[PDB]
């Protein structure tokens, strides 16, 4: 009711340099203000600020009293006009452009009506329950900046309430994209509502992990309603998607046991042991309808599990993984039926020459849903790295289209990510949502790629660390050798010295020729 | 010339449940028995132990006293017998297998045969100068396993003797298959002693570094002679390969007028600047002959610089880059027409989408020589993190078919790297490196993961720590949360929990079904 929270570090002092700007744009149809984050680097040497993304939400806010409800009046007039769904999908299809499409496509630099056609035609979500208010839209899809999930929550054996809000704030501040609330151990209505109500970035959850918790931790006793109390539970506080392993289907289960490293789904075992402790189908693929429902009350978007993901490389692109996916598609053009908003979650650990299989399949199977995939790790055999094994499959999915990038830390196999575990998560995320938008030429992308190759040429020191995703750590290395306030003018590093730094001698050569 | 030299720490305490082991095989020609290294990880509930590659060397050996000269008796035999040169592909055109060709065939589990024709046509070589007897050979080339080059070295600036020994021996601990000693401080012929007598790996130099060294840092004083003694100098020393910028042509330099980042080699750089100061041609290409002749005598392998490498992502695949290729076909070509051994230098800073095009020109204009590429950086926004950023990179180039791939540590644009960086530079790059057999379906690389997946499942957690590329690492960090004996036998971690584990669930799942 009342945790010891203690702040993160200032965003200034994680972002030399930096402020925390905000574009205003006017929703014409209600005039409504938005204020649209971003953040701007102040350089030197007559460049020119440069601007960027921000999901790190309002700062130095008592978490006791929670964000400003920055949507409250977005919702109110949406509810007095009257609406049968409450979906971006169905205002989409209806030829709606809402603040949330407004918001995205200025965050974006691209039109609100190309938001608009990207919403309606499933190609693109915004996860923007109505009960967040909180919430700073942001949206997920192919033809947008690729996206990063941080995952964090307790377990039974780690973590407190006071951590995890710290875990949000201090993922968001690396640039998370997105959260999800994964606790499975203490207080997990209470942890989330904390989480969301201090939360600026979209909120996921797997509402099957606390079903299992309302049943004791007998899987056996979970069913369809003990489900639906939960997702409602869970709408109302403010979720904005859903994991749901639906395409757990009961005769899949059998194509399983020839695996290396079996189901590795915490969601997806859970769903299979059910199935096979009644020989009954799947309980939310038979109330898929029941569960599009409650979605189209609140707006929470549907991220269809893969409870049959591959955990280990052996069992990557086997048959029991894309007969789930073969089954996400039926799920997602059945969701948008409904103006449900959709993304699909995908694998998992792949190595690289079967990656390009597993975005084929889904963007024909599913229609061009966004697609969510944790990783790909591409080989196993660096436990404590997996950040990296995962990036290098992260980055190459993300070239081929994938949407929403969920992270993996060093601790993956190993235990519960503490704060320092997920910051190296996010930034190594965030190298690959990058580098994926390079690869795509996504528009103005290698602009921040230049300013900091720029600043490195010029010498610029201070300019480059502060272009960087982790400045500090970028200026801390550089001065483990070169300390002193003049190396920050310096026409060499420690690598070099000064009469082998190869940009001193492009310097000198270019001067010559001139 | 008796430097305070300090031990690394043991193979076992970074190899817990290993042994070094070595494969006997006989030179039948010869008689010669050969030693080839090996690394066994011996594992519990019945599993066969796991035999797995070793670049580790011969260990506590003291540094004043130097390694075994392991190669002595092969190099002696093929003297008195008499040859006209005395490289590998000299040998391997004559019909002749030599004990450095079943040594790699052995390590690669590949017949010596086949080992002999890819060296004979190019597309392998074995760098193995028969100065340097202390030598474990190793094999180049898309056939076979991809490599990972640590460079070490000192600077004006930074470190000594002693830590350059350290980070040779350390870099190879952690799996560097050849290092380059780039040193462009103090005692750079010493230092480089102490490091071929105690290196079992291939060590390589850029020759023109001293070379400006020799003529006090004024690139204008160079010329043909000096970098010829240069060459002589450290061919007799044991160098294995040369990288020589010969490619850097007059008429290539103002293609990089117009460039961000200009010339980033420093060898290229330091062409750039002699040639535009006489305006003349590049003494190396000029040379290539006479370089070639001093290469036979010694087996000096030649890596052909790339000096217009693209040093940011707005540089990549630019006409300056391709102009060099084209060159550095022409040298690879000419340089087998007197059998030497040649692989080619490549990119740098490349954004995923550019890649493929690096590897389709290099493999076509320079007749499938080894490539060896220095990443590629897939992006220029996270200094502090290159080693990520390129470890997509040369994962990707890897996969693509490049034999060699350089490191880069979190220093790169920063700093000379310490002990620390070479560790985790090494470390992503054998991710890497491995990442591109699996997905090149090199034969056996996956029974590595396959080994680590089947422990994770079956909870053997020291095997799995055991099997991994740096197993402190991982057993440190599962036991921050669990850090128990009785949890290593646990059919759980901290991540889930026990109730939550998925492993678990699939354990039980499997056993219902019994
Ligand atoms: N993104 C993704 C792709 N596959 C799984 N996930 C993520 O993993 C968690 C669900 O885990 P599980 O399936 O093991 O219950 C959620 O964070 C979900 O988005
Ligand atoms: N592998 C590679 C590809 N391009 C450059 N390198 C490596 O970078 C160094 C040469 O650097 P420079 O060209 O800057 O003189 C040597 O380690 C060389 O193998
Ligand atoms: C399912 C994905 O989410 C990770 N995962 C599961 N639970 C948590 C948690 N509480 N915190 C962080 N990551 C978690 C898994 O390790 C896997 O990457
Ligand atoms: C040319 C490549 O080698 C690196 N490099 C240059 N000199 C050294 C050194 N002494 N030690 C380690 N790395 C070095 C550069 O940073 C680049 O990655
Ligand atoms: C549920 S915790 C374990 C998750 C597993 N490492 C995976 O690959 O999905
Ligand atoms: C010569 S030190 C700088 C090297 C540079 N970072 C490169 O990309 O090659
Ligand atoms: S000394 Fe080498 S690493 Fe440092 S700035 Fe110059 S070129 Fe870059
Ligand atoms: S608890 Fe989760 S992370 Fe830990 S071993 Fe089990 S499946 Fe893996
Ligand atoms: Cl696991
Ligand atoms: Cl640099
Ligand atoms: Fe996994
Ligand atoms: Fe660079």
Known sequence: SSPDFQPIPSFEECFPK?????????????????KVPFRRVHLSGGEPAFDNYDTSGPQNVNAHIGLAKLRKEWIDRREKLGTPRYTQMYYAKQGIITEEMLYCATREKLDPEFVRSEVARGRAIIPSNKKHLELEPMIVGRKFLVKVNANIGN?????????????????????????????????????????????????????????????????????????????????????????????????????????????????????????????????????????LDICNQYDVALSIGDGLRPGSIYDANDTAQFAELLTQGELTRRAWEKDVQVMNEGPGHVPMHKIPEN??????????????????????????????????????????????????????????????????????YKIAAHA?????????????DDALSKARFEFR??????????????????????????????????????????????????????
């Not at 309302?214 to 979720?239: C, H, M, P, S």
């Not at 994926?436 to 921040?448: M, N, S």
């Not at 970028?474 to 940009?503: I, N, R, W």
Request: charged share 20%.
């Open 18 to 34: 930096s402020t925390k700007e905000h574009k205003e744009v006017v929703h014409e149809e209600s005039g409504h203000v938005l």
């Open 436 to 448: 994926a938008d390079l690869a795509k030429q996504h528009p103005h992308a290698q602009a921040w």
């Open 155 to 291: 377990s039974a054996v780690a973590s407190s309430i006071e951590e995890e809000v710290y875990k949000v704030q201090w993922a968001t501040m690396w640039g998370a994209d997105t959260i999800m609330d994964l606790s499975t151990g203490r207080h997990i209505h209470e942890t989330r509502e904390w989480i969301l109500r201090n939360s600026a970035v979209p909120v996921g959850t797997v509402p099957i992990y606390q079903a299992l918790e309302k049943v004791d931790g007998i899987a056996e006793n979970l069913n369809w309603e003990v489900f639906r109390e939960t997702l409602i539970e869970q709408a109302e506080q403010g979720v904005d998607y859903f994991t749901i392993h639906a395409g757990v289907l009961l005769r899949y289960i059998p194509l399983t046991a020839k695996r290396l490293t079996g189901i590795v789904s915490r969601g997806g075992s859970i769903h299979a042991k059910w199935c096979l402790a009644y020989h009954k189908e799947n309980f939310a693929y038979e109330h898929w309808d029941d569960i």
């Open 359 to 428: 975005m084929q399949k889904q963007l024909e199977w599913c229609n061009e849903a966004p697609f969510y995939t944790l990783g790909p790790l591409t080989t196993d055999i660096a436990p404590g790295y997996d950040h990296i094994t995962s990036a290098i499959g992260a980055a190459n999915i993300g070239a081929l289209g994938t949407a929403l990038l969920c992270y993996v830390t060093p601790k993956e196999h190993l235990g519960l990510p503490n704060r320092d575990d997920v910051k190296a998560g996010v930034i190594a």
């Open 461 to 514: 020191w201070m300019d480059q660390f502060a272009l960087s995703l982790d400045p500090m750590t970028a200026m801390s290395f550089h001065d483990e050798t070169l300390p002193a306030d003049g190396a920050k003018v310096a026409h060499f590093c420690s690598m070099c010295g000064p009469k082998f730094c190869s940009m001193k001698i492009t310097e000198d050569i270019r001067k010559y020729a001139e």
